[PDB]
Amino acid sequence: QCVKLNDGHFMPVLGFGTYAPPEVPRSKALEVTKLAIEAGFRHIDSAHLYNNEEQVGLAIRSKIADGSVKREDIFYTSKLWSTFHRPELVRPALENSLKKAQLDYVDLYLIHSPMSLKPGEELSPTDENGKVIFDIVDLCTTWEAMEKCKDAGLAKSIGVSNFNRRQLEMILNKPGLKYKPVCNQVECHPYFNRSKLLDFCKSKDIVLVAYSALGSQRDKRWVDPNSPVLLEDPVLCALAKKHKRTPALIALRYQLQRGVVVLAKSYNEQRIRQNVQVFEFQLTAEDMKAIDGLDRNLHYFNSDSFASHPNYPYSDEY
Ligand SMILES: NC(=O)c1ccc[n+]([C@@H]2O[C@H](COP(=O)([O-])OP(=O)(O)OC[C@H]3O[C@@H](n4cnc5c(N)ncnc54)[C@H](OP(=O)(O)O)[C@@H]3O)[C@@H](O)[C@H]2O)c1
Ligand SMILES: COc1ccc2c(c1)c(Cc1no[nH]c1=O)c(C)n2C(=O)c1ccc(Cl)cc1
């Protein structure tokens, strides 16, 4: 149940999403990561941004200690936050994630976003007028620092997140490149299916990893409440009824059959266990075309405050 990455390592094709908004107590991340491993999740997606790597690492430690898994059975992802793009900050940021999680390595380290921010430990640097402070960094130099993290053994694989085709090509065409990104983790669901970007990634042996594949958590700081609810889509709901599954399972299976590695966040014990049932049924070729028809170019995150960023990913066609 894995895909082979272009560096030879293997990534489980279903991943557990661990982000929860700050109102959720941090003990929950510990509890649900254990439930996820107990349910069969082996790929766990975290990040410095999520303020939960300590709890996710504790959950992994606990399941290793009780004999449920070994460390090599777990695929753990962290991400470099955008205030750490300057190359001298990359390894210290990774080492800090490893210390928090009490891991010797991450299986995957990503550049969280191409949209560089003012360097510092402050995650949301803002000016005297409350505006986020951008930074200008050559992401090829960030990538060179990521490559050194892989050679140092601290990350088994390295990749990117929220890149568009042009930004991927900047890395791929970098002189003296040693490691291609193994993946590009991007927003991907039936209302924003990234088919052109997926075709490009396939042509370069880069895995597309889908986040907000269930339509996001609809956080009201970020999500227009008038945006359509993905899991209420009539086509998804009709397919769920036809297959005797759930709209969530349809949305996850859609990604698996188009060669996309799919993440699924749930902090609910029964939904966690439901999502691993994605492997138990199949969509027909006609089902897949019907879902392909749902694309609305819908980004669940209101990105107006970032649209002026030089590395804003959504100005290009893809
Ligand atoms: N690289 C990035 O920039 C980036 C951005 C966004 C997300 N991510 C990663 O992707 C992960 C998931 O994306 P997401 O956080 O946007 O959430 P999601 O996977 O789109 O799921 C969204 C909501 O679906 C609900 N859900 C889960 N399973 C369900 C089921 N079987 N039936 C019905 N509802 C179900 C969950 O609510 P309950 O918890 O109540 O089940 C969750 O809040 C994140 O946790 C994070 O790891 C990365
Ligand atoms: C749909 O929800 C979204 C969408 C985008 C998101 C996020 C959640 C999150 C935060 C988060 N929540 O859960 N896990 C995560 O990492 C970030 C850090 N995003 C980006 O950086 C991003 C890239 C391009 C653009 Cl234009 C805007 C934002």
Side-chain angles (χ1 to χ4, degrees):
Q1 283 168 348
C2 286
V3 63
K4 187 182 197 191
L5 306 174
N6 59 36
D7 67 358
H9 289 115
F10 296 90
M11 167 184 289
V13 304
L14 172 69
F16 180 64
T18 72
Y19 180 76
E23 310 85 58
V24 181
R26 304 295 90 172
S27 56
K28 292 299 287 182
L30 168 63
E31 284 165 14
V32 304
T33 300
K34 294 198 277 215
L35 295 174
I37 293 166
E38 288 168 14
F41 282 92
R42 292 298 178 265
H43 172 167
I44 300 170
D45 184 83
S46 186
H48 178 71
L49 181 71
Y50 302 168
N51 186 34
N52 70 9
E53 289 188 285
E54 176 175 22
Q55 290 68 47
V56 174
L58 256 163
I60 289 161
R61 253 202 313 304
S62 304
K63 299 307 294 179
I64 294 173
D66 70 28
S68 305
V69 294
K70 301 155 134 192
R71 169 68 181 95
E72 58 260 38
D73 301 325
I74 296 288
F75 187 99
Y76 176 80
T77 297
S78 192
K79 313 189 186 69
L80 176 81
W81 184 238
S82 310
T83 60
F84 303 112
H85 281 182
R86 295 195 178 197
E88 73 275 11
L89 307 173
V90 172
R91 182 170 174 151
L94 178 49
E95 287 168 339
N96 180 68
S97 283
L98 291 174
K99 185 165 205 179
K100 297 269 186 306
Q102 292 287 297
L103 298 173
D104 301 326
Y105 63 92
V106 299
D107 295 83
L108 177 58
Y109 203 42
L110 309 176
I111 305 185
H112 205 140
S113 166
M115 290 189 289
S116 313
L117 300 176
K118 172 175 188 286
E121 305 294 338
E122 163 64 62
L123 297 186
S124 300
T126 42
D127 64 15
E128 297 168 314
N129 269 111
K131 315 241 181 53
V132 173
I133 301 168
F134 302 157
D135 192 23
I136 295 176
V137 187
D138 178 4
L139 298 174
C140 285
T141 72
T142 313
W143 189 252
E144 282 160 5
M146 299 282 288
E147 291 179 327
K148 294 171 178 297
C149 284
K150 176 173 164 65
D151 283 332
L154 305 173
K156 299 288 200 191
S157 294
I158 49 175
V160 298
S161 180
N162 294 301
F163 279 39
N164 63 25
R165 167 180 179 144
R166 175 184 67 72
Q167 289 161 337
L168 283 179
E169 284 171 331
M170 180 201 63
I171 303 302
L172 292 174
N173 293 335
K174 180 190 94 69
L177 182 73
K178 186 169 186 181
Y179 301 118
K180 298 158 65 170
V182 299
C183 68
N184 189 18
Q185 184 182 125
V186 302
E187 185 179 349
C188 183
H189 43 77
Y191 287 164
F192 187 33
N193 68 40
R194 322 303 299 272
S195 58
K196 293 179 185 192
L197 183 58
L198 173 60
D199 275 336
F200 175 78
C201 286
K202 280 168 174 166
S203 82
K204 305 294 171 185
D205 202 31
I206 297 161
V207 170
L208 196 152
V209 181
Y211 72 70
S212 296
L214 302 177
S216 88
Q217 311 192 30
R218 303 188 63 88
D219 191 289
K220 265 313 307 153
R221 307 168 287 164
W222 304 338
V223 176
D224 173 21
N226 268 64
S227 60
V229 180
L230 180 77
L231 298 188
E232 292 173 6
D233 182 83
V235 164
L236 294 181
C237 289
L239 285 174
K241 182 169 186 56
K242 166 164 105 161
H243 287 274
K244 311 214 212 315
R245 300 293 176 169
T246 67
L249 281 171
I250 303 300
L252 298 177
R253 186 72 201 186
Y254 170 65
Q255 303 295 2
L256 292 189
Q257 291 184 203
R258 61 205 297 260
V260 166
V261 169
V262 68
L263 307 175
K265 172 265 179 188
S266 180
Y267 275 36
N268 178 272
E269 163 153 21
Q270 286 315 116
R271 286 189 286 273
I272 292 171
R273 296 177 70 81
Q274 185 188 115
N275 294 342
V276 306
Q277 294 181 312
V278 70
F279 297 104
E280 292 180 358
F281 77 101
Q282 313 165 238
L283 295 165
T284 74
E286 296 311 304
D287 297 342
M288 291 295 289
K289 293 182 163 285
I291 304 171
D292 287 338
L294 299 177
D295 195 308
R296 308 187 172 205
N297 197 36
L298 173 59
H299 319 341
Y300 273 111
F301 187 99
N302 185 345
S303 55
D304 289 338
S305 64
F306 277 95
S308 72
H309 201 291
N311 283 352
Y312 184 62
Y314 295 143
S315 300
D316 291 347
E317 297 223 56
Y318 71 102

